[PDB]
């Protein structure tokens, strides 16, 4: 796949739509995230072009998967990332100087800095992008005003150059917002506000996932197949309101209603619908039809064909070989969803690469009841020290390609990172021998303000000097989302070995959370801050507190003190350190 761009190159035709982007590199992101775009042509600021034709990003489709290139000055082009194995995000931290990006202007408050303006935009239910007038702006009336904006697409309706002004996008898709996600799905209720769009969805999960990446969608209603009107089954209405809430909730039956989750975006799957839909046919434009032994082999053929967005498989239910119908549409979605014709339908997985990797499903493999195996806790790592001889020191969790999150108190009088050894996918400590490969820590990032474990600011990062080939034995866990502050985890689990006395096999044990208030009582002499969380009634220092929520695993806490294997253990409150982790990693 062709990630780089093209100095002065234009693609001829394909014109699907035309939008305004602040740069080619971001135009490439739009292209990637659009359900039909393969390639694009962006117009830069230049002598050569009328000011109106600038900042123009033209998304295109070709059947051959390329178009004819034409040497043209000021033009940058132009392939989407759909063809790539690399992960991809829509996070754009760029601030755009002397640049005014246009849309519906809706708050017009006054602000300290470009930064605090961006923060406001990110924290607001409606904000797609902002413009900020610097101290240095002419009109004294206007200088320092931070006006927020939205459009139908999320991109500006126009872009103009204007001196002493700075523009930028919401950073919700950098996991930076503190906007609370509402996960509640209201059944037998409908919503009645504006109707900004609609697709055909097979279930309300899909429906609400589409509400999530649709920029103008704040909430939704799904009319299930069991609805009255024929014309309205599987209809996913995408809604919004001036306030941002649904005004009213009607009892109105066979319909589910929910909210966007743009805020908890990473940590939840969005683009990845791995599920199959049985006796279900997805209507759309046919692209190929091929012999296929399983409906799985159908998916793999859809996923492998870049233009394919979804498929139906027809089982011989004969000679064994099914017909696999690879399909596409205008948005990413069937034009009609039909039941009762014997097909198996789903979607391309070419879309999962956009989802955050710690959201991939878990296998199924064993419940053990007491002890672990093969690939049960692919994020849990054992931390070895070479002094005085080689021993287990801490538990850690994989949270990045290159990163471990763990306790600071773990690194007491460690002088150099060069004494450390991280091992992944380990069960029996027995399994570690000199030949055994390990990751070497490049760097230790202890929190400044850390003094004592019971003082609480107890959190460390290991930058590994070589990255992790992700496997069934070595995958990350997800950080809790700032939107999810009000979440009530009820499926929480401590893992580790013993750390004193150490167990050979990886110990696993499900534990209940315990409220801060409640813990504070049991803990006489020491203060329990909001930057800690508690639990109890069998793991190491730095070991993870992992909670499963909606079949996705979160790193809720890191081990810090505790008494005694009955009083609850104290933990570092990972959510409260999210700005921090993101800061120190990007």
């Amino acid at each position: 796949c062709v990630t780089q761009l093209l100095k002065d190159t234009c693609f001829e035709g394909g014109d699907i739509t035309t939008v305004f982007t602040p740069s080619a590199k971001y135009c490439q992101v739009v292209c990637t995230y659009h359900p039909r775009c393969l390639l694009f042509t962006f117009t830069a600021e230049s002598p050569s072009e009328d000011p109106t034709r600038w900042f123009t990003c033209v998304l295109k489709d070709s059947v051959t998967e390329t178009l004819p290139r034409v040497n043209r000055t000021a033009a940058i082009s132009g392939y989407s990332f759909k063809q790539c194995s690399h992960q991809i995000s829509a996070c754009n931290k760029d601030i755009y100087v002397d640049l005014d990006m246009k849309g519906i202007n809706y708050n017009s408050s006054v602000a300290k800095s470009a930064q605090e303006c961006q923060e406001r935009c990110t924290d607001d239910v409606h904000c797609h992008f902002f413009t900020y007038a610097t101290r240095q702006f002419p009109s004294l009336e206007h200088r320092n005003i931070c006006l927020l904006k939205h459009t139908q697409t999320g991109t500006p309706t126009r872009i103009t150059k204007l001196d002493k002004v700075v523009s930028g996008f919401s950073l919700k898709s950098c996991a930076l917002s503190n906007l609370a996600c509402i996960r509640d799905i209201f059944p037998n209720t409908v919503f009645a506000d504006s109707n900004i769009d609609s697709v055909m969805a097979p279930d309300a999960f899909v429906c609400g996932r589409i509400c999530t990446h649709h920029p103008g969608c704040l909430f939704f209603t799904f009319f299930s197949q069991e609805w009255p009107k024929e014309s309205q089954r599987n209809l996913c209405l995408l809604k919004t309101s001036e306030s941002g809430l649904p005004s009213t909730r009607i009892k109105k039956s066979k319909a589910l209603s929910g909210f966007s989750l743009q805020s908890c975006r990473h940590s939840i799957p969005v683009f990845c619908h791995s599920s199959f839909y049985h006796d279900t046919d997805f209507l759309g434009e046919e692209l190929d039809i091929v012999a296929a032994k399983s409906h799985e082999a159908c998916q793999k053929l859809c996923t492998n064909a870049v233009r394919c967005q979804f498929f139906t498989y027809t089982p011989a239910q004969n000679e064994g070989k099914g017909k696999c119908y690879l399909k596409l549409s205008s948005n990413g979605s069937p034009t009609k969803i039909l039941h009762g014709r014997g097909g198996i339908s789903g979607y391309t997985l070419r879309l999962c690469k956009m989802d955050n990797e710690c959201t991939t499903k878990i296998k199924p493999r064993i419940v053990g009841g007491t002890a672990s195996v093969r690939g049960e806790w692919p994020w849990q790592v054992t931390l070895h020290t070479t002094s005085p001889t080689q021993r287990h020191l801490c538990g850690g969790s994989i949270i990045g390609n290159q990163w471990i999150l763990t306790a600071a108190h773990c690194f007491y009088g460690v002088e150099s990172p060069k004494i450390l050894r991280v091992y992944s996918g380990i069960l029996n400590q027995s399994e570690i021998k000199e030949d055994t490969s390990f990751f070497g820590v490049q760097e230790i990032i202890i929190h400044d303000q850390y003094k004592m474990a019971e003082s609480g600011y107890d959190i460390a990062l290991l930058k590994l000097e070589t990255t992790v080939n992700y496997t069934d034995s070595q995958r990350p866990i997800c950080l809790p989302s700032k939107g999810d502050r009000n979440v009530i985890y009820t499926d929480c689990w401590v893992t580790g070995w013993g750390y004193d006395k150490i167990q050979n096999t990886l110990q696993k044990a499900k534990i209940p959370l315990v409220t801060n208030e409640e813990c504070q009582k049991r803990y006489r002499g020491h203060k329990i801050t909001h930057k800690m969380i508690c639990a109890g009634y069998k793991g190491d220092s730095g070991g993870p507190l992992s909670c499963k929520h909606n079949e996705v695993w979160h790193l809720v806490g890191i081990t810090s003190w505790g008494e005694g294997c009955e009083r609850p253990g104290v933990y570092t409150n990972v959510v409260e350190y999210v700005d921090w982790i993101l800061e120190k990693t990007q």
Binding site: I104, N105, S139, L147, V165
Partner: peptide
């Protein structure tokens, strides 16, 4: 709507 910048 608010008017935008001059």
């Amino acid at each position: 709507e608010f008017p935008d910048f001059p």
